[PDB]
Amino acid sequence: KDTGATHDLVYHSKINTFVWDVEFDIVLSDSKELNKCYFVKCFNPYRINGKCDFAVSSIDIFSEGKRLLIENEFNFKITKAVHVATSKDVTEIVLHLSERISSPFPIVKEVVYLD
Amino acid sequence: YDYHFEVNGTVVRHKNKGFGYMERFFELKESCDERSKLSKKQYERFNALFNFFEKNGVICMAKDAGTLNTSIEINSLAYHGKYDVMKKFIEEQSVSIEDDYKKAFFLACLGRWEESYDLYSNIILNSIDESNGCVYYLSQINRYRIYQSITQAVTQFNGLGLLTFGRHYKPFTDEFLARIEREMTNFNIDDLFNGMPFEFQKKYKILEFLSDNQFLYDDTVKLFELTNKVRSEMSEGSYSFGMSSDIVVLLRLYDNLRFLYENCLWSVSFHEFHQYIRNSMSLLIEKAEYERTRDIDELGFSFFGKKSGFFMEYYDFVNISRHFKIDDIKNLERSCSIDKIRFGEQEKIEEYLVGIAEEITKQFSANGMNVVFYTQFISEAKAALYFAKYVKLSEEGLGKIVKALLFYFPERDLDIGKRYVWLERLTKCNELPKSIISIIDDFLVLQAEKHIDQNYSEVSSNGLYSRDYGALIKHFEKNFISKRLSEITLCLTQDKQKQIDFLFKLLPLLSTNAKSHLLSFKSVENINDLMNGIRIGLIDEFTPEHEELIIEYLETRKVNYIVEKEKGIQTFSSNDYMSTFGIWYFLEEINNSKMEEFIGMDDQYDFFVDPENFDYKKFIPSWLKNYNDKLLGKIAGNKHMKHHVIEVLKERVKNSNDKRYLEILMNYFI
Amino acid sequence: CSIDKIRFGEQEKIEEYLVGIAEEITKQFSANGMNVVFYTQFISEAKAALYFAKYVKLSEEGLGKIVKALLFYFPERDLDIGKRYVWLERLTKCNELPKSIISIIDDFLVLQAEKHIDQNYSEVSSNGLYSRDYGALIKHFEKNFISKRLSEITLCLTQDKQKQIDFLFKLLPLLSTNAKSHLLSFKSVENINDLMNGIRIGLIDEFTPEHEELIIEYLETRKVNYIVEKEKGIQTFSSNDYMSTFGIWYFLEEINNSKMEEFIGMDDQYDFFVDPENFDYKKFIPSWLKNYNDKLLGKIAGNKHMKHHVIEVLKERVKNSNDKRYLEILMNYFI
Incomplete structure (x- = not known):
């Protein structure tokens, strides 16, 4: 459990989410494969909206270093995660922590507070 | 050290063993008959002394004092941001060494560092012959400062x-960077004062401090008074007679700023001064807020409820704009109640806001530009535009500012999303008129035309795009249709898929025929397509076919749930489709009742579909952390849910001591 | 923030340092000869150390030495009777009053009894706390203690001695049976001060009609004086806090008399407690919430007229202030 990479992890109770510098390789819907994907959450609870808007947070997905837009039902199943500092053994930590947190997308890279 | 001079302007005796010459001068200045008794040459000397003491701001002795007033007047172009006037003065033919010294300060201010260096060298060459010790010394100092700045910038x-x-x-060439390096070899600023003729040393000792590596250390150390808490219970008031710590600190800051700007000293662009200003202003604001809070606590809220401890004026606004970043202003805002602080002299700050707009338009509309000047200008521009939230502005100024921000600001430091927040901060004090609504429509039209190219793609740091602009324009104007966008829609074709989607984002702004034509290009055939349309496409109503698709999905998932009970295995999940349907039904979006049969799969689904019979022991408080204001209000309205939510929030607040849950509990459910 | 939650170690060294402080104080104050300049700076540090010692555990002998130094050798110009009382009360949170410390307190009370013989003497406290409270402290931990020297002093007391009679009456519970009989024979309840003393010591549990007449007479005199001052334009502020107690009683129904409703207008708290419906809630000051006790706070959250305004104040103070007491009050009782 003890490692030098975990010193960069932070916890924001406002969103009950973890923040860390890690990049993931994913396979979605058991039919699509994507490499080096990372995500960013933005806390805008009081944003202009209609009747169908119900969440305070909006999440955006980026495969590699470019924006990713997907319409197909979003299914997630982790296969590999790695630290930017070239540190391994993080897949088990990621799976464990994601199991602890019931909130969607337990781990992300950046959090933006607009309010 | 024969006397004490105080920032209020009154002088006092101290450690003087002799005749009180200053008292006699004050009496002479008070008595016009005593003056006439003096000789003619002495009369002229007295007149000069009186003019000097008046300009500086010395009034009279402390005991003969009264209700002395105070004001701040800095008569310098560098502090007024009059770029055109500065350029015109530069273009003039310097008539004196003083005209050449101010011109060099202006040139350095405008980003032409090399020209300023050359001018300073010429002034240094001429001064020694002219026997102008002060200008010679100050020009040496400023040349060394410019050289340091050049090296750091490179x-x-x-x-x-x-x-x-x-x-x-490449702002600077190579031959010039070699020439300066060869000139300033082994040059030590430390000994500059000691080599001067001893008459200069005896006269101008007060300027020696300009040769030190760091100054303002005593000013920074004196800030500790502002943090005292004992004064609140009982304020000694012994720091100064007739003035408190706030007044003394603010007047000292004004004196420092005036002395540095009015003499054209090139130390006003270094990190030490910026840090000093930031610390002073932040401490003053914090002290004022704490005093207001304590006064509210002690007496009734009817008194001090919104007392103005630190009133903001033009000088305060300009200083905060120039010497703060974005993060610093954010820290100041979150630390204190800025909205409660009224702003004075709005016509001046407004002129500065619409004046920053003209200069940015000139800078970025025109191809020509200076790298260093842009670097030092954009931070101030961004800070001023951020801080203009609490300032009322006229319609013409608002329109000019909006145009300059939207069109002429480089995407490099802004974004679709970054710009949006800027505008909304402006909208909270000056509600959208028709003119800037039309300007926003024009901006939307331009960025719509931008989508013709396939490779074009908006980039945002906070997930905000043109959809939000379309929402904002409609929020203030319920009935609005864009004729330009409507005709764009009517000329649209299928192969323009990028434009089709982008315009689908902006459906509400269209006309009837335009929106019919657009929606003729897309349709929904499955629950996934329905959710995609609701997310992007703005499906407004759940038609019976949509509810039938939902019911089919829930029954299929019911069969899969029975087979899962058989399995006893569940690998992983990503997004709950069922919770969305449950909340939609709770919001009275899905009017069907068949979904009620498919109950018992998800705890959130059961809770939001049948609150009365839901087992609240299965409730997860973290669920509350994701709901939005409308859903929170709806939940608070429901009788079956209110008290359980109250109890769980109470337990979490008592144990977790988390500020978010407490804030929700006080804001919505109590 | 709560300092108590923070752990403290090396307690032996802290105890040694504060025992050094106590012995230095004793040496300094023991003789008239003193280092004049050393006094001013040392006093501040000693006061800080003794006030912050609330969060450390001390041995019995060290506790006794500290108490003796604080009680019998601290200059009065710095710590008064009330300040001494509150500082000592701060120290009984980690170590309950031992018998030796109670003996020292009895020595202090017997000493004050000897200082009362001269008719030209009085106790000055800046917080309203006096010798009586000290005795109460002992009775808060040992209910059955009865002083011997003090009881004898009461038994040999005479009517010509009036200061002593009242002073011992204020501390009636600590006296013996015969001493109590003698003192109550010599003194009787006539004024409001005697009534309050008896209520505090349990002499009179309930408000009899005669005490109501005394209260109404005092209120009428105060009303006349206030009317005269208001006509003069020199309206004086309420003092002695008796009006607050009367209003609290009327809210609690301890005193039953329509005359109370006729005494609205001069005091804000009295009007709030007497006529909650018509009270102007913009004059409410939050500090009173802290002064209230558990029972009064609970009864406040029961009335319909004052609950909503109080919760607006509590929510305002927990959002505008840096005091955790407001949140505790708002959570425990009102929510």
Whole structure:
């Protein structure tokens, strides 16, 4: 459990989410494969909206270093995660922590507070 | 040390063993008959002394004092941001060494560092012959400062400039950078004062401090008074007679700023001064807020409820705009109640806001531009535009500012999303008129035309795009249709898929025929397509076919749930489709009742579909952390849910001591 | 923030340092000869150390030495009777009053009894706390203690001695049976001060009609004086806090008399407690919430007229202030 990479992890109770510098390789819907994907959450609870808007947070997905837009039902199943500092053994930590947190997308890279 | 001079302007005796010459001068200045008794040459000397003491701001002795007033007047172009006037003065033919010294300060201010260096060298050459010790000394100092700035700028540009700018920038050539390096070899600022003629040393000792590596250490150390808490219970008031710590600190800050700006000293662009200003202003604001809070606590809220401890004026606004970043202003805002602080002299700050707009338009509309000047200007521009939230502005000024921000500001430091927040901060004090609504429509039309190219793609740091602009324009104007966008829609074709989707984002702004034509290009055939349309496409109503698709999905998932009970295995999940349907039904979006049969799969689904019979022991408080204001209000309205939520929030607040849950509990459910 | 939650170690060294402080104080104050300049700076540090010692555990002998130094050798110009009382009360949170410390307190009370013989003497406290409270402290931990020297002093007391009679009456519970009989024979309840003393010591549990007449007479005199001052334009502020107690009683129904409703207008708290419906809630000051006790706070959250305004104040103070007491009050009782 003890490692030098975990010193960069932070916890924001406002969103009950973890923040860390890690990049993931994913396979979605058991039919699509994507490499080096990372995500960013933005806390805008009081944003202009209609009747169908119900969440305070909006999440955006980026495969590699470019924006990713997907319409197909979003299914997630982790296969590999790695630290930017070239540190391994993080897949088990990621799976464990994601199991602890019931909130969607337990781990992300950046959090933006607009309010 | 024969006397004490105080920032209020009154002088006092101290450690003087002799005749009180200052008292006699004050009496002479008070008595016009005593003056006439003096000789003619002495009369002229007295007149000069009176003019000097008046300009400086010395009034009279402490005991003969009264209700002395105070005001701040800095008569310098550098502090007024009059770029055109400065350029015109530069273009004039310097008539004196003083005209050449101010011109060099202006040139350095405008980003032409090399020209300022040459001018300073010429002034240094001429001064020694002219026997102008003061100008010679100050020009030596400023030339060394400019050289340090040049070296640091070169290092910064060669290190990171090429990346952020997207291209390596060569502000300075190589031969000139070699010439300055060869000139300033082994040059030590430390001994500059000691080599001077002893008459200069005896006269101008007060300027020696300009040769030190760091000054303002005593000013920074004196800030500790502002943090005292004992004064609140009982304020001694012994720091100064007739003035408190706040007044003394603020007047000292004004004196420092005036002395540095009015003499054209090139130390006002270094990190030490910026840190000093930031610390002073932040401490003053914090002290004022704490005093207001304590006064509210002690007496009734009817008194001090919104007392103005630190009133803001034009000088305060300009100083905060120039000497703060974005993060610093954010920290100041979150630390204190800025909205409660009224702003004075709005016509001046407004002129500065619409004046920053003209200069940015000139800078970026025109191809020509200065790298260093842009670097030092954009931070101030961004800070001023951020801080203009609490300032009322006229319609013409608002329109000019909106146009300058939207069109002429480089995407490099803004974005679709970054710009949006700027505008909304402006909208909270001056509700959208028709003129800037039309300007926003024009901006939307331009960025719509931008989508013709396939490779074009908006980039935002906070997930905000043109959809939000379309929402904002409609929020203030319920009935609005864009004729330009409507005719764009009517000329649209299928192969323009990028434009089709982008315009689908902006459906509400269209006309009836335009929206019919657009929606003729897309349709929903499955629950996934329905959710995609609701997310992007703005499906407004759940038609019976949509509810039938939902019911089919829930029954299929019911069969899969029975087979899962058989399995006893569940690998992983990503997004709950069922919770969305449950909340939609709770919001009275899905009017069917068949979904009620498919109950018992998800705890959130059961809770939001049948609150009365839901087992609240299965409730997860973290669920509350994701709901939005409308859903929170709806939940608070429901009787079956209110008290359980109250109890769980109470337990979490008592144990977790988390501020978010407490804030929700006080805001919505109690 | 709560300092108590923070752990403290090396307690032996802290105890040694504060025992050094106590012995230095004793040496300094023991003789008239003193280092004049050393006094001013040392006093501040000693006061800080003794006030912050609330969060450390001390041995019995060290506790006794500290108490003796604080009680019999601290200059009066710095710590008064009330300040001494509150500082000592701060120290009984980690170590309950031992018998030796109670003996020292009895020595202090017997000493004050000897200082009362001269008719030209009085106790000055800046917080309203006096010798009586000290005795109460002992009775808060040992209910059955009865002083011997003090009881004898009461038994040999005479009517010509009036200061002593009242002073011992204020501390009636600590006296013996015969001493109590003698003192109550010599003194009787006539004024409001005697009534309050008896209520505090349990002499009179309930408000009899005669005490109501005394209260109404005092209120009428105060009303006349206030009317005269208001006509003069020199309206004086309420003092002695008796009006607050009367209003609290009327809210609690301890005193039953329509005359109370006729005494609205001069005091804000009295009007709030007497006529909650018509009270102007913009004059409410939050500090009173802290002064209230558990029972009064609970009864406040029961009335319909004052609950909503109080919760607006509590929510305002927990959002505008840096005191955790407001949140505790708002959570425990009102929510």
